[PDB]
């Protein structure tokens, strides 16, 4: 019974609100153009994107790549994908399957009689 | 100079660190099981998931659905799209009608007359 939300909850609202403010101003609220994408990362992550700032082409490359519709805009789902892609490419991996001892098995029933 | 990083930058580290701590403890660091998924949302979003807590099955349903590999775990990319799905699933709007669940069988004398 807690009336105070965790720090994580606050962050969720902050992320949604921040994108909404920039997005609503320009283009559809649920989509981001190249200008908004660059602006959001530059102001929020100027230190992390210092190298990105030097290469303008590098920055537009990722945005366009993430846009599957080639509509020069990214969907909400597409936007979060971009962040994940930046952190790690995540190459496709395959596994044969799951296996293990299986903890043997339960005992059978004697089914004996008096 | 940049001086200090914005809240958005801090939030990014917080999200990654939080998932990492729970994930590394149980299962692979880059994957989340049902227990971690439920635990992360419950502690961070106990107020938002109050209705979710009541229905345990509803909660496991979302996790399993998001898992395309049916490997009982979600990738980093899969995890972030789960949140997006929760926010908006394009659910149909509710409307008053005589529709309802079907049960038993109709009278033999009666006919479907399609
Ligand atoms: Ca926009
Ligand atoms: Ca698109
Ligand atoms: Ca894990
Ligand atoms: Ca999976």
Curated annotation (Swiss-Prot), chains A, B:
Domain of life, per lineage: Eukaryota
Q: Which residues bind Ca(2+) 1?
A: 23, 26, 28, 31, 36
| Basic and acidic residues: compositionally biased ranges | 93-102
Lipid bilayer topology: Peripheral membrane protein
Q: What is its main location?
A: secreted
Task: Name the consequence of residue 78 to Q.
Answer: Loss of resistance to bacterial invasion
Answer yes or no on keyword Nucleus: no
Binding locations of Zn(2+) = 20, 30, 91, 95
Example GO CC term: the record gives: extracellular region
On tissue specificity, the annotation reads: Calprotectin (S100A8/9) is predominantly expressed in myeloid cells. Except for inflammatory conditions, the expression is restricted to a specific stage of myeloid differentiation since both proteins are expressed in circulating neutrophils and monocytes but are absent in normal tissue macrophages and lymphocytes. Under chronic inflammatory conditions, such as psoriasis and malignant disorders, also expressed in the epidermis.
List the InterPro entries hit by this protein, alphabetically.
EF-hand-dom_pair, EF_Hand_1_Ca_BS, EF_hand_dom, S100/CaBP7/8-like_CS, S100_Ca-bd_sub
Carrying Pros-methylhistidine, the residues are 105
Keyword Calcium in the entry? The reply is: yes
The residues listed in the UniProt record as binding Ca(2+) 2, with positions renumbered to this chain, are 67, 69, 71, 73, 78
Q: Which residues carry this modification: Blocked amino end (Thr)?
A: 2
Renumbered to this chain, region (Disordered) spans 93-114
The effect of residue 83 to A is: Loss of antifungal activity
User: Residue ranges of the EF-hand domain?
Assistant: 12-47, 54-89
Ordered alphabetically, the record's keywords are: Antimicrobial, Antioxidant, Apoptosis, Autophagy, Calcium, Cell membrane, Chemotaxis, Cytoplasm, Cytoskeleton, Immunity, Inflammatory response, Innate immunity, Membrane, Metal-binding, Methylation, Phosphoprotein, Repeat, S-nitrosylation, Secreted, Zinc
UniProt effect for mutating residue 81 to A? No effect on antifungal activity
Sum up the protein's function in the record's words: S100A9 is a calcium- and zinc-binding protein which plays a prominent role in the regulation of inflammatory processes and immune response. It can induce neutrophil chemotaxis, adhesion, can increase the bactericidal activity of neutrophils by promoting phagocytosis via activation of SYK, PI3K/AKT, and ERK1/2 and can induce degranulation of neutrophils by a MAPK-dependent mechanism. Predominantly found as calprotectin (S100A8/A9) which has a wide plethora of intra- and extracellular functions.
According to the record's subunit comment, the protein's assembly and interactions are: Homodimer. Preferentially exists as a heterodimer or heterotetramer with S100A8 known as calprotectin (S100A8/A9). S100A9 interacts with ATP2A2. S100A9 interacts with AGER, and with the heterodimeric complex formed by TLR4 and LY96 in the presence of calcium and/or zinc ions. S100A9 binds quinoline-3-carboxamides in the presence of calcium and/or zinc ions. S100A9 interacts with amyloid-beta protein 40. Calprotectin (S100A8/9) interacts with CEACAM3 and tubulin filaments in a calcium-dependent manner.
Tell me what this protein is called. Answer: Protein S100-A9
Per the record, the gene is S100A9
